[PDB]
From a paper:
Adhesion G protein-coupled receptors (aGPCRs) are essential for a variety of physiological processes such as immune responses, organ development, cellular communication, proliferation and homeostasis. A defining feature of the aGPCR family is that most of the members are autoproteolytically cleaved at a highly conserved GPCR proteolysis site (GPS) in the GAIN domain, which has been suggested to be critical for the maturation and function of these receptors. The cleavage results in two noncovalently associated fragments: an N-terminal fragment (NTF), which includes most of the extracellular domain; and a C-terminal fragment (CTF), which contains a small part of the proteolysed GAIN domain and the transmembrane domain (TMD). To uncover molecular details that govern the tethered agonism of the aGPCRs, we determined the structures of ADGRD1 and ADGRF1 in complex with different heterotrimeric G proteins.
To provide further insights into the autoproteolysis in modulating receptor activation, we also determined the miniGi1-bound structure of ADGRF1 with the proteolysis-deficient mutations H565A and T567A introduced in the GPS motif. Of note, a similar stalk–TMD interaction mode was also observed in the miniGi1-bound structure of the proteolysis-deficient ADGRF1, which shows that the cleavage is not required for the stalk exposure and subsequent stalk-induced receptor activation. A similar stalk binding mode is observed in the structure of autoproteolysis-deficient ADGRF1, supporting a cleavage-independent manner of receptor activation. Indeed, the proteolysis-deficient mutants of ADGRD1 and ADGRF1 exhibited a wild-type level of basal activity in our functional assays. One possible explanation for this proteolysis-independent activation is that the receptor may exist in multiple conformational states; these are likely to include a portion of receptor molecules in which the stalk is released from the GAIN domain, which leads to a collapse of the original folding of the GAIN. The dissociated stalk tends to interact with the receptor TMD to trigger G protein coupling, which, in turn, stabilizes the stalk–TMD interaction on the extracellular side, and may subsequently induce the stalk exposure of more receptor molecules by altering the equilibrium between different conformational states. Alternatively, the cryo-EM maps of all three G protein-bound ADGRF1 structures display strong densities for a lipid molecule bound to the intracellular region of the receptor.
Residue numbers in the entry:
A (entry chain A): 10 to 53, 182 to 230, 241 to 354
B (entry chain C): 7 to 62
C (entry chain R): 567 to 852
D (entry chain B): 2 to 340
The structure:
């Protein structure tokens, strides 16, 4: 039958594209407006899909945030992602409060109970000079401890990691982004390859 | 901004207000009448014989 | 019997009175442990299992469980029958099946051990699920069958296939059919041991990036849990076979080898399944 | 400021609206259909199990001839099935893999898609050159496309996540009519059998009935307290049923302008994902997030049957025009035909 042969041809194409799409990392990108997401995506409308290849691995990044609608009605389709990329602009202070709330919402979703976070603390170079003009302790009601960068930067990590209520099932990876971009893509690959390695352990009844 | 929205919102209620509403019991009987009229034409309700069933 | 004969060229007479009691209890509860393990697995074989990698582990676990159950019942009836009344009716047949099923059990644990090694170093390398299933059965059963048939086709015509005391492969001095079982057993354990250390390195990997220490002693409890569940399923308790080969006269080694391996059925139900929190809550409630 | 006076004027109009509905609320359909015999327990078996999708199936639409079936999945492939023989006719590689709705034209010549890409894509099935191609690419919505239905070969109505429904002309690719009034994101819409008036359910727990020719909200129904996810007309066309995130299906009458039935159970606590009606309208089929569907008697609010057999949340279902079978597409990438 010609119709049966047509279905067989279609099946080959479906499986051919399925294995091709099975190697896609399929990451999810979030963050505040103008929070350094451009640097983390351009190192090489609604949501935009960006693709870059690193070490013979193809990555898909979805810049969610341009929808401006009820996120809970379409955030369930972003499951099965390898991890979540978060961008925090350390230079901005007023946008940090909404960034923490946005980070709080994503980590506590019932869909994202196991997806890791590879949050990036951007603009660390501009944070050195800007903190001198306006101290972190004075700007925020909560105490920032020592004014040194070795403690102020670590304080931001404490305020972000503690938002994760699921410590056991989620592994937050933190990195600082600088002018160079060669190592920026390396961290994503290292973080992703650690998640898939760890994910196999749960499926093998080991973790 | 909000003044224009309030002006348009109140006009919609007035348009919706002056409509003809029949009795619920009269409307309820119409739904029951339609189901009884097309009861024989519902293959899901009445088990279709496999001879004329295309999904058998 | 003493259950040490599987790996023991000679069983001393002093251990036999004391070692026989623990192994019979161990074999007895092993049969019951496997029955419950298979029953609970059969009900929830595919209802909750959907991952492609988890698909491979389910078939490996039932194959290990199935091999141990049938081999154990063949072993218990292979030692309770006299070798003179029925030297071939019940004694010869039991030895071949016991030897082949144990070899299948050893080789199946290699497939499970290789599978863990495959998903750790070759994380991005993906082959078809059916292709992995086909090659696993070919080596899980076909390779032990290849070794088993040549064992009965070489030693048996020489009439040195049967030990006088017990229905099991003879040791002798000229013909050593037991090498067809001892050597594969140590080879699988040795290959499994390096797989064990490979998992240990991944759990002990340093923090990626500038992540703080955060929780303390969180990784060490995973290590203890991993070795508790991985040791019986990989047959790491069978490593004592080399100890009884070299000396075969130690009081302690025969006891520990007998009790640990005879209880492997209990270490599968209690540790392989019950310890697994993924299926632990789904079973206790109902 | 005259804003306070306007709000008071609007408030008293709502009181008049509910008082007028309360006058006819004395009679209830639940106490009227107690005399008719119940449909009883009904059994449905999976005659066919369409497989081939590699991701969650969000939408499906039955063919106008009750034979062809189109489904959309997050894998990025839109597949037209032959339900009789399980065969596959087409497999469209959608440009955007984030598809949330799909429609099959009543003439059987066009298929539409849409989702997080903010645009509606229409594909010409009957192409003389062989492989199908994107006939038109409707754009203009600032929110995700939640639903789309074909009025004819040149008219399509779309539900968007910008609290606005629109009617599009395929030839020019422009919004002929824009429907506004929803304060929440519109999730679904249903067309009347005469394709003259349609009702859309939104996230503001309200279903508004619109007029295609005019472009105005004729009626508004507020019976739910959560997001409305499923809208389906009665076969007669004078009533429709709504599915919400409260495991409650409510039947509204257009002429009575009041909720009639409330299909709910104590056991179910999930949310409705899709609803449908049989040819006679006596049987109501509603999708659920608890991995299985339910069958409701539309005149007695009794659970006539259960359509369990899916390993994940049921996302879409539909009944053929001839009412011969009901399909169901869940998140386990499997389409099942029940009869
Ligand atoms: C029935 C159930 C089922 C069963 C399970 C199991 C089966 C099979 C096994 C395997 C499979 C196959 C293998 C692969 C390998 C490759 O390819 O590649 C290599 C290079 O790459 C090389 O690598 P290296 O690094 O050198 O090493 C490796 C090692 N191992 C262990 C992994 C092998
Ligand atoms: C990690 C723990 C739980 C299990 C270890 C199992 C294996 C690796 C152990 C158990 C018994 C061990 C043997 C015990 C005694 C001897 C005799 C001497 O020649 C040293 C090596 C040798 C031959 C050991 C080799 C390693 C061995 C086979």
């Amino acid at each position: 039958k010609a119709a049966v042969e047509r279905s067989k041809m279609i099946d080959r194409n479906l499986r051919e594209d399925g294995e091709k799409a099975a190697r896609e990392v399929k990451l999810l990108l979030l963050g505040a407006d103008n929070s350094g997401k451009s640097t983390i995506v351009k190192q090489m409308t609604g949501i935009v899909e960006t693709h870059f290849t690193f070490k013979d691995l193809h990555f898909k990044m979805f810049d969610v945030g341009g929808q401006r609608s009820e996120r809970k009605k379409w955030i369930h389709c972003f499951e099965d992602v390898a991890a979540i990329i978060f961008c925090v602009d350390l230079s901005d202070y007023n946008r940090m409060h909404e960034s923490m709330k946005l980070f709080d919402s994503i980590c506590n979703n019932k869909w994202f109970t196991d997806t890791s976070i590879i949050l990036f603390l951007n603009k660390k170079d501009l944070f050195e000079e800007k903190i001198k003009k306006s101290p972190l302790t004075i700007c925020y009601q909560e105490y920032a401890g020592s004014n040194t960068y070795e403690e102020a930067a670590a304080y931001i990590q404490c305020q972000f990691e503690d938002l994760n209520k699921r410590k056991d099932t989620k592994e937050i990876y933190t990195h600082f982004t600088c002018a160079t971009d060669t190592k920026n893509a390396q961290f994503i690959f290292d973080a992703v390859t650690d998640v898939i390695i760890k994910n196999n352990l749960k499926d093998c009844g080991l973790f | 901004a909000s003044i224009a929205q309030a002006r348009k919102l109140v006009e919609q209620l007035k348009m919706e207000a002056n409509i003809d509403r029949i009795k619920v019991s009269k409307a309820a009987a119409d739904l029951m009448a339609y189901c009884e009229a097309h009861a024989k034409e519902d293959p899901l309700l009445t088990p279709v014989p496999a001879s004329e069933n295309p999904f058998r | 019997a003493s259950f040490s004969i599987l790996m023991s060229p000679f069983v001393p007479s002093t251990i036999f009175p004391v070692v026989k009691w623990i192994t019979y209890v161990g074999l007895g509860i092993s049969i019951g442990s496997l029955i419950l393990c298979l029953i609970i697995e059969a009900l929830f074989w595919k209802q909750i299992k959907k991952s492609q990698t988890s698909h491979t582990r389910r078939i490996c676990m039932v194959n290990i469980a199935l091999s141990l159950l049938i081999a154990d019942v063949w072993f218990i009836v292979g030692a309770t029958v006299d070798t003179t009344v029925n030297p071939s009716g019940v004694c010869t047949a039991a030895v071949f099946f016991t030897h082949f099923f144990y070899l299948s059990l050893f080789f199946w644990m290699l497939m499970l051990g290789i599978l863990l090694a495959y998903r750790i170093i070759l994380v991005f390398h993906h082959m078809a699920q059916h292709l992995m299933m086909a090659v696993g059965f070919c080596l899980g059963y076909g390779c032990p069958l290849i070794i088993s048939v040549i064992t009965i086709a070489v030693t048996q015509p020489s009439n040195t296939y049967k030990r006088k005391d017990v229905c099991w492969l003879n040791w002798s001095n000229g013909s050593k059919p037991l090498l067809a079982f001892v050597v594969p057993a140590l080879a699988i354990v040795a290959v499994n041991f390096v797989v064990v250390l490979l998992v240990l390195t991944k759990l002990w990997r340093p923090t990626v990036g500038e992540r703080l220490s955060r929780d303390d002693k969180a990784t060490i409890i995973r290590v203890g849990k991993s070795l508790l569940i991985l040791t019986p399923l990989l047959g790491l308790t069978w490593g004592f076979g080399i100890g009884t080969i070299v000396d075969s006269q130690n009081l302690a080694w025969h006891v520990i080898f007998a009790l640990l391996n005879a209880f492997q059925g209990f270490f599968i139900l209690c540790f392989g399944i019950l310890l697994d929190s993924k299926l632990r809550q789904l079973l206790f409630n109902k | 400021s005259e804003l306070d006076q306007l709000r008071q004027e609007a408030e008293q109009l709502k009181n008049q609206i509910r008082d007028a509905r309360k006058a006819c609320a004395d009679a209830t359909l639940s106490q009227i259909t107690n005399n008719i015999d119940p449909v009883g327990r009904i059994q449905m078996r999976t005659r066919r199990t369409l497989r081939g999708h590699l991701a969650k199936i969000y939408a499906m639409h039955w063919g106008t001839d009750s034979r062809l079936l189109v489904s959309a999945s997050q894998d990025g492939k839109l597949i037209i099935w032959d339900s009789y023989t399980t065969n596959k006719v087409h497999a469209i590689p959608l440009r955007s893999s984030w598809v949330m709705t799909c429609a099959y034209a009543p003439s059987g010549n066009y298929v539409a898609c849409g989702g997080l890409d903010n645009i509606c894509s229409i594909y010409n099935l009957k192409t003389r050159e062989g492989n199908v191609r994107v006939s038109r690419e409707l754009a203009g919505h600032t929110g995700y496309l939640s639903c789309c239905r074909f009025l004819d070969d040149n008219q399509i109505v779309t539900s968007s996540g910008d609290t606005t429904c629109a009617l599009w002309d395929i030839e020019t690719g422009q919004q002929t009519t824009t429907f506004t009034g929803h304060t929440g994101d519109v999730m679904s819409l249903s067309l009347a059998p005469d394709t003259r008036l349609f009702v859309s359910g939104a996230c503001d727990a309200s279903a508004k009935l619109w007029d295609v020719r005019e472009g105005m909200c004729r009626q508004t129904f507020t019976g739910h307290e959560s997001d409305i996810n499923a809208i389906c007309f009665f076969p007669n066309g004078n009533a429709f049923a709504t599915g919400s995130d409260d495991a409650t299906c409510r039947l509204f009458d257009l002429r009575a302008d009041q909720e009639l039935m409330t299909y709910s159970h104590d056991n179910i606590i999930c949310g409705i994902t899709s609803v449908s009606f049989s040819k006679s309208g006596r049987l109501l089929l509603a999708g659920y997030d608890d991995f299985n569907c339910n069958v409701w008697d539309a005149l007695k609010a009794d659970r006539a049957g259960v359509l369990a057999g899916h390993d994940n949340r049921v996302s879409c279902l539909g009944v053929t025009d001839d009412g011969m079978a009901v399909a169901t597409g869940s998140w386990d990438s499997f389409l099942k035909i029940w009869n």
